[PDB]
Design a protein around this nucleic acid. Structure first.
Ligand code: CA
Ligand code: K
Ligand code: ZN
Lengths: 341, 618, 117
DNA sequence: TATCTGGCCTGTCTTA
DNA sequence: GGTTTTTGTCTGGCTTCACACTTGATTTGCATCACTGTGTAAGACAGGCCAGAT
DNA sequence: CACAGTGATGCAAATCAAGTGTGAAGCCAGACAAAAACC
């Protein structure tokens, strides 16, 4: 668990809060740049490689059959197993919410340069309204694949939305959304266990269950210390979703999750309170039928991280987190660190 | 005892010295004036004064025998405060000193001026929209609103680094119209129309937007805001009425680029280049504006309800901001025109024959083409197909030309031709950076000697105004050996000065008909001169603004009648008011600076308040 | 004030005239003439000594329509007369003791708009 | 051979 | 002292004016708050480096 | 221990406006005399 400072190249400005990282065969890539793509990199997707604590962001190109998705902030991101990535919702540089979903897949890797395929997936049925700050995960039940989507935020509906509060945001209804990528349909489920709206939580997916951790509820304005298990059954008939509360849940919004080994993940970062950052880290051990959350040794944070009001980060993939804190202003706007496990 | 001066003596004492003249006066009054000693002394004194050229004392005594009280109505004190740039704190010093030395309250105290302001600011007058505006509150008492418009600021969200205050767009327009009511009535009358006539008036509004640098951040707690501002403003440009099958020009702004009539609508501390914050703040303004295109404002003017239809023209934008907000590429791109699809290379070979094809609507389509890539093309082919529209527009602008920045770019270009004509680059192709620096130094020193210009780091309106003259070419020719090229420079500048009035005057048709007539002809020979006798600079390339100026000026002039009046120069001039008002007319704290400047800037723009300063000029 | 010898003379003469002629209104300009002739060496000594006594005395001395309460008040004025500062005290007490003042305030409400315009 | 002053360079320190 | 001019007194009644209280509502005066700008370039001195001098 | 602002706030202080009759202050009238400055 070693904290390490990182330097950045000419295009350090691209990196903003709400950015995303995707892992394709150990090569990390970057998505969600600040501002619209420029002639330097039209796709907005970057090869993100740190070599000896120096990070270079290099442009990647798309396939001929690809969509040019806009940069998205706070989308729900998921990894699908042939390896591909799902992006749903998020904010565009124009502050719109996109209802679209995109699939990112490696098209070609000749001479250690990667061409990506970005295809838009049409979705019919009970489509979730456009959202940010929400989780999407893929579950496996009885040799069947299903997508789960929960929580988040959006703007008020057109009937009630007014220009004076044009930007006001509210939690989406806490309906669990099954989304089958094979057919392009989505099914909504209302559950008694899930009464409040929730955003900026952590999602961990094992087999047919997805655990919901922390998050923030806008109406209540509380960061609840609760854990929710959501099991999905895929029989020949219509799937059924059952939820269970399991006490001993962490209280944190905006936390970052990384997988150290199979079945053990680390949760770091995020906020305990609006003005209080969560400096502790928690270890999750998963059982086929059980989940374990254990306090672990806190890292050796620097005085910058300790006294920052805000921090943001994403998972790089091989148990290493890329963290960012607001930096000095005339210099570079943000200071970046890498935390290994 | 030497006789004292008469004025020093006590009443009893002055009576005794004048009792001999007093009795003599009583006679004259009984004999000649019916015994009115009062009236005959009053007249003898008033006449003694004017005899010694002391009219002011006589005139005041007149006003005090009449006895009429002197005082200024608060709304007039307001006008004097707002328009002479006095701060309330300073005005208070004047008011207090006048009341104590004259014993009379000539100027009103600040609470009443603060009450007279209420009429002039948005939210005071009632109105309604038929049909009601989409997604807009129907409340009519909405004044200064938070410019973040409920932007989420919890530590989970995106970081909020700006402060912003605004008016609701419609609520502001209403207050502008009510400010103009006397000028609309008088405008009908002078068109021989009914004062009470209430038909469907049409208001054409110029929309302007600007980023500023070098806005110092204040100390004290608040968001750590950037050291920049953005300003959204509107100018009421003309109002016509439909009387029969005629459109009658009830009102047209006499001074379309004056700070007096650029009305502030949105002040924010933020960076125009930061797209995420810019769209967050202005999107509420654009949504209010989209709604107003589809409704008719009924509002009560002079007792009689009137209806207003609105046309919004966004022309007070410099090229960089236009490209930003209509999804176009940056000004270095090969797609140089924001008005057409031509390419930087094409604009150098053809020069003149290009029509206006881009539009806010087209750009929205093209972005969607860009985003969706429906012919599964390569990025080069995709970009070629959408002509560089690779981001989603969020603001509708007129495809035009800003006369201010056009004037500036062009002069900046000529300044460069001047340098390269001094190094004889037409004859010698390669020159060192040092050899180039001295060309500029030569020309700089000479513009000082012959034209009284000092060198400036960045090109200026007034510099451009003063540089683009035939006299300056004279100056510059004193440094160039070849007179074959004195000829070329003289022609180039003759053609440009034949062209300039078209795109700068308010009404070329009336003001320079022959210049308008000949534009297509003159712009051709200008283009040919660049292509032949200036090959070294203009083979394969041209500047964005040379293109705009050579290829689209006539079409714009017939589509709209003017280019100069739709320029940014008025809104730029408004920035000067921003800097001054931020220092000298606002509470000096991060959570009140923006709103205090916005309210007081609005007052400075009120025609009802301006009229009181032309009372002398009845 | 301090009084000269001649002035004391004139005052005493006015006293004599008033006791001799009670129903009589003296003219001023004629009285100064006759008094001046009487003044113009032993008669005057009494007045002369009196004047210094006066000097000593001088030393010692040197060292928009109306409020609803107004509308109510004006009408109750005649009754109080039947029963200014005193009247106002009574008016205020009785008004304080009194839905009683709702009508007067309604009249004032109609008047307030008229003042504003 | 075996040193050796002088400019030269950069970089910090002091006041603006 | 003789002489010159400011300030009076003597009286009845002329006018104009401020005052007399109370009540509720406006209109003025004033202190309060946290922050503004004007302070905003160049020389002294040390220590390393290497070529041409001793 | 720099210092004169920068505008909105909100609470104290002043002001208003009505009823009428008190006393107080200045004034007029002719004639003459205190004081207070100059030859
Ligand atoms: Ca600008
Ligand atoms: K101006
Ligand atoms: Zn063009």
């Amino acid at each position: 668990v070693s904290l390490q400072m990182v330097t950045v190249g000419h295009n350090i400005a691209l990196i903003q809060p709400g950015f995303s990282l995707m892992n394709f065969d150990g090569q990390v890539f970057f998505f969600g740049q600040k501002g619209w793509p420029k002639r330097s990199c039209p796709t907005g997707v970057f090869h993100f490689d740190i070599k000896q604590n120096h990070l270079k962001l290099k442009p990647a190109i798309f396939s001929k059959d690809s969509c040019y998705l806009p940069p998205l902030r706070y989308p729900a991101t998921c990894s699908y197993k042939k390896h591909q990535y799902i992006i749903h919702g998020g904010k565009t540089p124009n502050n719109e919410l996109s209802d679209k979903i995109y699939i990112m897949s490696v098209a070609c890797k000749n001479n250690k340069k990667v061409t990506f395929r970005c295809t838009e997936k049409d979705l019919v049925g009970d489509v979730p309204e456009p959202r940010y700050g929400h989780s999407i995960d893929v579950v496996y039940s009885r040799g069947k694949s299903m997508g789960v989507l929960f929580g988040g935020r959006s703007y008020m509906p057109s009937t009630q939305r007014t220009t004076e509060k044009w930007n006001s945001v509210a939690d989406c209804l806490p309906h669990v959304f099954l989304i089958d990528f094979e057919f392009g349909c989505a099914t909504s489920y209302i559950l008694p266990e899930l009464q409040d709206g929730l955003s900026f939580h952590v999602s961990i997916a094992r087999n047919d269950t997805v655990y919901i951790l922390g998050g923030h509820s806008l109406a209540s304005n509380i960061r609840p210390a609760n854990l929710y298990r959501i099991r999905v059954d895929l029989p020949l008939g219509t799937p059924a979703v059952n939820c269970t509360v399991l006490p001993g849940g962490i209280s944190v919004s905006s936390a970052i999750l990384t997988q150290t080994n199979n079945d053990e993940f680390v949760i770091v970062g995020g906020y305990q309170l609006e003005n209080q950052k969560r400096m502790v880290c928690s270890l999750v051990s998963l059982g086929d039928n059980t989940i374990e959350i254990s306090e672990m040794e806190t890292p050796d944070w620097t005085s910058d991280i300790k006294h920052s009001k805000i921090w943001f980060g994403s998972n790089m993939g091989n148990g290493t987190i890329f963290l960012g804190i607001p930096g000095d202003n005339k210099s570079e706007a943000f200071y970046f660190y890498t935390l290994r496990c | 005892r030497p006789r004292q001066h008469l004025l020093s003596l006590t009443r009893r004492a002055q009576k005794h010295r004048l009792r001999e003249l007093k009795i003599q006066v009583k006679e004259f009054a009984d004999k000649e004036e019916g015994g009115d000693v009062k009236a005959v002394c009053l007249t003898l004194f008033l006449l003694a004064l004017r005899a010694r050229n002391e009219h002011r004392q006589a005139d005041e005594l007149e006003a005090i025998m009449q006895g009429r009280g002197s005082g200024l109505q608060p709304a007039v004190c307001l006008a004097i405060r707002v328009n002479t740039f006095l701060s309330c704190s300073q005005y208070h010093k004047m008011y207090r000193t006048v009341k104590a030395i004259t014993g009379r309250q000539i100027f009103q105290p600040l609470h009443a001026l603060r009450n007279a302001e209420k009429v002039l600011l948005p939210g005071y007058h009632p109105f309604e929209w038929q049909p009601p505006l989409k997604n807009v509150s129907s409340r009519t008492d909405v004044g200064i609103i938070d410019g973040l418009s409920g932007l989420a600021s919890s530590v989970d969200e995106y970081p909020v680094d700006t402060i912003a205050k605004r008016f609701r767009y419609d609520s502001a327009l209403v207050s502008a119209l009510m400010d103009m009511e006397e000028d609309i009535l008088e405008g009908m009358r002078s068109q021989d129309l009914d004062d009470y006539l209430n038909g469907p008036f049409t208001v054409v509004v110029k929309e302007s937007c600007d980023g500023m640098g070098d806005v110092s951040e204040k100390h004290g707690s608040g968001p750590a805001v950037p050291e920049k501002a953005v300003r959204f403003s509107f100018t009421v440009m003309r109002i016509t009425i439909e009387h029969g099958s005629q459109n009658v020009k009830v009102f047209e702004e006499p001074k379309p680029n004056s700070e007096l009539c650029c009305k502030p609508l949105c002040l924010m501390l933020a960076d125009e280049s930061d797209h995420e914050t810019l769209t967050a703040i202005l999107s509420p303004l654009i949504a209010e504006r989209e709604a107003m295109k589809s409704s008719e404002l009924t509002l009560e003017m002079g007792g009689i309800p009137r209806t207003f239809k609105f046309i919004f023209r966004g022309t007070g934008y410099d090229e960089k901001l236009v490209r930003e907000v209509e999804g176009l590429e940056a000004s270095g791109s090969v797609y140089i025109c924001t008005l057409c699809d031509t390419t930087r290379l094409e604009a150098s070979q053809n020069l003149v024959f290009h029509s206006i094809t881009r539009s806010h609507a087209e750009n929205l389509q093209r972005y969607e083409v860009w985003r969706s890539n429906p012919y599964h093309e390569s990025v080069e082919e995709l970009r070629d197909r959408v002509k560089g529209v690779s981001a989603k527009p969020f603001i509708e602008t007129v495809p035009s030309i800003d006369a201010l920045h056009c004037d500036i770019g062009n002069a900046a270009e000529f300044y460069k031709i001047f340098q390269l004509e001094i190094g004889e680059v037409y004859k010698h192709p390669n020159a060192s950076k040092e050899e180039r620096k001295r060309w500029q130094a030569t020309l700089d020193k000479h513009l000082r000697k012959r034209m009284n210009l000092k060198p400036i780091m960045r090109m200026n309106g007034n510099f451009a105004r003063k540089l683009m003259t035939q006299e300056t070419v004279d100056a510059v020719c004193e440094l160039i050996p070849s007179e074959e090229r004195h000829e070329a420079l003289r022609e180039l500048m003759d053609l440009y000065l034949k062209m300039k009035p078209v795109w700068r005057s308010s009404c070329p048709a009336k003001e320079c008909p022959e210049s308008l007539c000949q534009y297509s002809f003159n712009s051709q020979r200008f283009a040919e001169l660049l292509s032949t006798k200036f090959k070294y600079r203009y083979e394969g390339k041209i500047t964005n603004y040379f293109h705009k100026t050579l290829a689209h000026v006539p079409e714009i002039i017939e589509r709209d009648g003017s280019i100069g009046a739709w320029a940014s120069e008025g809104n730029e001039s408004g920035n000067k008011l921003f800097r001054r008002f931020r220092k000298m007319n606002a509470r000096q704290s991060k959570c009140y600076e923006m709103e205090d400047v916005l309210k007081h800037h609005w007052l400075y723009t009120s025609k009802y308040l301006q009229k009181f300063m032309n009372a002398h000029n009845a | 004030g301090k009084m000269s010898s001649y002035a004391f003379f004139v005052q005493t003469c006015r006293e004599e005239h008033k006791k001799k002629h009670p129903d009589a209104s003296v003219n001023f300009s004629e009285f100064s003439k006759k008094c001046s002739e009487r003044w113009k060496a032993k008669e005057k000594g009494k007045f002369e000594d009196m004047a210094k006594a006066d000097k000593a005395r001088y030393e010692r001395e040197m060292k928009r329509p109306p409020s609803a309460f107004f509308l109510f008040c004006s009408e109750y004025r005649p009754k109080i007369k039947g029963e200014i500062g005193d009247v106002a005290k009574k008016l205020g007490e009785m008004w304080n003791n009194t839905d009683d003042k709702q009508p007067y305030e309604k009249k004032a409400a109609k008047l307030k708009e008229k003042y504003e315009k």
